[PDB]
C-alpha cells in the first residue's frame with residue numbers, strides 16, 4: 001500500500017502522473033561531491049533541478065522515478081532537497097548501471113544482493129532514504145558481472161516486492177537476455193520494465209516481451225540528434241530518429257493490445273558528467289521542455305493520433321502505480 | 332616550501348618526522364565506504380581498526396603517513412581526519428587518479444583533470460578544506476590514452492603548486508620509464524617524482540637508471556609476500572613470491588650504488604580493502620601482523636644488521652620524505 005520516496009512513504013494514490021525513468025543528475029559515484037564546479041556549483045545544479053521539476057509539476061507531473069544508481073552518482077540528499085523544494089515526489093533507486101567500480105565489480109551475487117537489500121530496506125547511505133526500485137543495465141550481451149547484477153536484482157525484488165527497471169541496447173534486443181536471467185531467478189515479468197525500448201523500431205521484439213508480461217519502457221521519446229547530424233557525440237547518444245517516430249511506438253503497442261504494459265518517460269536530467277563536456281547544453285537545446293516534454297508534447301500528440309483520454313491516463317497514472325507498488329510473489 | 336598540508340592542517344617540515352610515504356587508511360572505490368560501510372563491518376569498526384594500527388605505528392616511531400588514496404581509491408578525507416586526530420599521527424592526503432576512474436573522470440580532458448587536481452591541492456577536497464599534499468597516478472604496463480592525460484595533468488598540477496607526484500607501477504614492466512618520459516615532456520623535475528612499487532622488480536639496472544636521472548624510487552611493498560600461501564591464487568597474484576628480505580635488500584642495493592638520497596620506503600598497508608577479493612584484508616593481516624609498523628620494527632633493524640649506518644637510515648626515513656613532500660616550485 002505504500003511507495004518509498006525521498007520524503008518517505010506515499011500511498012499509491014498520491015503518486016498520480018508519474019515519469020518512470022528520469023534523473024536529477026547523470027554522474028559517477030562521489031563525483032558531484034568531489035567536483036561540484038563541473039556543474040557550476042552544487043547550488044546551481046539544485047536550482048536548475050528545482051526550476052525544471054516545478055515546470056514539470058506545472059504540466060501535471062506528480063512523481064518522477066530517479067533511476068540513478070550508486071554508479072550513476074546518485075546523491076540522495078540532493079534528491080531529497082529538490083523534491084522538497086519543488087514539491088514533486090521522487091522515487092530513489094538501488095542497483096548498478098554499467099560503470100561499477102572495482103569494489104562492486106569484484107563482488108559475488110550474494111554480496112550484491114545484500115547491498116541492494118540494504119538500500120531498499122534500511123536506507124541509502126546513512127540517510128534512512130529507502131529505494132523504491134532496482135536499476136540494472138546491459139549494452140549488448142551481458143558481461144559476466146552484469147549477469148550477477150541481474151540475478152541479485154531479481155533476488156532483491158523477490159524479497160522486497162520492489163520492481164526492477166533496465167537500461168538496454170534495444171537494437172541488440174538486450175531485453176530478451178535480461179528476461180531470461182530474471183526468469184531463471186523466478187522473477188515475475190510484471191515486476192520488470194525493459195527500458196529504452198523506444199530506441200528500436202522492432203516492433204516484433206517489443207511485442208514479444210509485452211506478451212510475456214514485461215513492462216516496456218518507452219523513455220527516450222525526446223532523444224534525437226536530428227539537426228545535429230554534425231555532432232558525432234550527440235548523434236551517437238541521441239540517435240537520428242524523431243520524437244514522433246519514437247512516440248508512435250506507444251500507439252503501436254497500444255494498438256497491439258498492450259496498453260497495460262507501457263511506461264513512458266524522457267530519461268532527462270539537469271546535470272550530466274558521465275559523457276562529453278557540454279552534452280547537457282546540447283540536450284537542453286534539443287528539448288527545452290525537459291521532463292515536461294511528455295505531458296506537454298507526447299500526450300497531446302498521441303491523443304491527436306486517436307489515443308483515447310482514458311488510455312493516456314491509464315498509461316501515465318495507472319501503469320506506474322501498479323509497477324511501483326511493492327508486490328510479493330504469491331506463494 | 333615551508334609547510335606540508337595534512338588532514339589536520341599545515342605542518343612545518345620538521346614536524347613530519349619519520350614518514351611512511353605510500354600507505355592507505357582504506358583501499359576502496361569512490362563513494363563505496365559511505366554506501367556500504369558494512370562491507371568493512373561498520374564505519375566505526377574500520378575507524379577503530381585504523382586507530383589501533385596507527386597508534387601501534389606511532390609507538391614504533393612513525394610520525395606521519397602519506398595516504399595515497401585518490402578519489403578513485405575511495406579516499407574519505409573525513410575518515411582520515413578522524414583517525415589522524417584520534418591516533419595523533421599526521422596524515423597527508425592525495426589527489427590524482429588511480430586505475431579505476433569512473434566515466435565522469437575518464438571522459439575528461441587534460442585541462443579539465445588539471446583543474447580538478449588543482450582544486451584538491453589549493454582549495455580542498457570535497458567541502459572540507461583539507462588540501463592534498465601529493466598527487467597520485469598510475470599505470471599497469473603501457474599507459475592507456477587516458478592515463479597519459481592523467482600523468483600530464485599531474486605534472487601540470489605539480490608544476491603550479493610544488494606538490495610532488497607519486498606513482499603506482501607494474502615495476503617488472505618498467506612502467507617508470509614511460510612515466511618519466513611523459514613527466515619530462517611536461518617539464519616536471521624528476522626530483523618531484525616518486526616511481527612507486529619499485530621493489531616489485533629485481534631489475535636493479537632499471538631502478539638505478541631512473542635514480543641516476545633524479546627520480547625518487549619508492550620501495551613500498553616490503554612486507555608484501557605470498558610465500559607460504561602458494562595455494563591462494565588471488566593472494567599470490569597480488570603479493571608475489573619474493574620474500575620481504577629480498578625486497579628490503581633493494582634498499583641496501585640502491586644505497587650501495589650511491590642513491591641513498593633518492594629512496595622512499597613504505598609498506599603500502601591498509602585497514603580496509605574492498606577493491607580486491609573479499610577477505611584479502613584478513614589474508615594480508617596474517618601475512619604481516621605488524622602492518623604499518625613493519626618498516627620501523629623489522630626493516631630498519633634488518634638493514635642496520637646488514638651494515639646500513641644509522642645516519643643513512645635516518646636520512647631515508649626522515650630527510651628524504653621531508654625533501655620530497657616540501658612543496659617546491661621550479662626555479
Ligand SMILES: OCCc1ccccc1
Pocket residue numbers: 259260310311312313314315318319
Ligand atoms: O482499465 C483500462 C484503463 C487503462 C488503460 C491504459 C493503461 C492502464 C489502464
Ligand SMILES: OCCc1ccccc1
Pocket residue numbers: 591592593642643644645646647650651
Ligand atoms: O648526507 C645526508 C644524510 C642522508 C642520508 C641518507 C638520505 C638522506 C640524507
Ligand code: NA
Pocket residue numbers: 004120121130131160
Ligand atoms: Na523498503
Ligand code: NA
Pocket residue numbers: 336452453454462463492
Ligand atoms: Na595547497
Ligand SMILES: [Zn+2]
Pocket residue numbers: 021022023067267
Ligand atoms: Zn537513464
Ligand SMILES: [Zn+2]
Pocket residue numbers: 353354355399599
Ligand atoms: Zn597503494
